[PDB]
Write a protein that binds this ligand. Structure first.
Ligand SMILES: Nc1c(N2CCc3ccc(CNC(=O)c4nc5sc6c(c5c(=O)[nH]4)CCS(=O)(=O)C6)cc3C2)c(=O)c1=O
Ligand SMILES: [Ca+2]
Ligand SMILES: [Ca+2]
Ligand SMILES: [Zn+2]
Ligand SMILES: [Zn+2]
Length: 163
């Protein structure tokens, strides 16, 4: 099955909610980084992401520090930047970002957009990739460019799951 053990969403129209923010960026910047991160995946699959302001969305997005209720604590500045749960009900699909990081919209360490795009890959059922140029590669490194789009390896990945 190509990616045994990695769940997938049964529906293509998913909702998401940004539960809180980070002092490092303006609220609009956080919202846009998230929107664009989702767009990277939507343009290469049938996935459609819709934002809600309250209630239970399919994908919860939040900034938390150290222990935050899911037995997968963050580690303070640097190191682990965020993590996301594979597709499923409840915590499934949720993405958490380390609130102790300096979040940016530049090449400066920990560009929210890039981190979120990577995490959403996980929220959608993708595992890490060995392709060093892939968005889902295990190590973060911001590579500035003109137009941002999903590397072909990541397109192969999402297509393999959702078409
Ligand atoms: N591993 C772990 C973490 N991360 C989450 C954040 C994160 C983000 C990204 C990567 C690997 N990818 C990159 O660093 C990266 N990918 C791409 S694809 C792409 C680009 C990039 C890129 O700049 N960096 C930029 C030009 S583009 O035309 O838009 C296409 C790895 C990780 C590893 C943790 O936290 C943790 O534990
Ligand atoms: Ca969820
Ligand atoms: Ca950290
Ligand atoms: Zn968490
Ligand atoms: Zn990852």
């Amino acid at each position: 099955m190509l990616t045994p053990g990695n769940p997938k969403w049964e529906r293509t129209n998913l909702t998401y909610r940004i539960r809180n923010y980070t002092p490092q960026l303006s609220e609009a910047e956080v919202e846009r980084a998230i929107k664009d991160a989702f767009e990277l995946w939507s343009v290469a699959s049938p996935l459609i992401f819709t934002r809600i302001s309250q209630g239970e969305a399919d994908i919860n997005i939040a900034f938390y520090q150290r222990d935050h209720g899911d037995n997968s604590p963050f580690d303070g500045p640097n190191g682990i930047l965020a993590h996301a749960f594979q597709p499923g009900q409840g915590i499934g699909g949720d993405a958490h970002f380390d609130a102790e990081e300096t979040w940016t919209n530049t090449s400066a360490n920990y560009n929210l957009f890039l981190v979120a795009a990577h995490e959403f890959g996980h929220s959608l059922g993708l595992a890490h990739s060995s392709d060093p140029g892939a968005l889902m590669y295990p190590n973060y490194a911001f590579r500035e460019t003109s137009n941002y789009s999903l590397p072909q390896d990541d397109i192969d990945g999402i297509q393999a799951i959702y078409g």
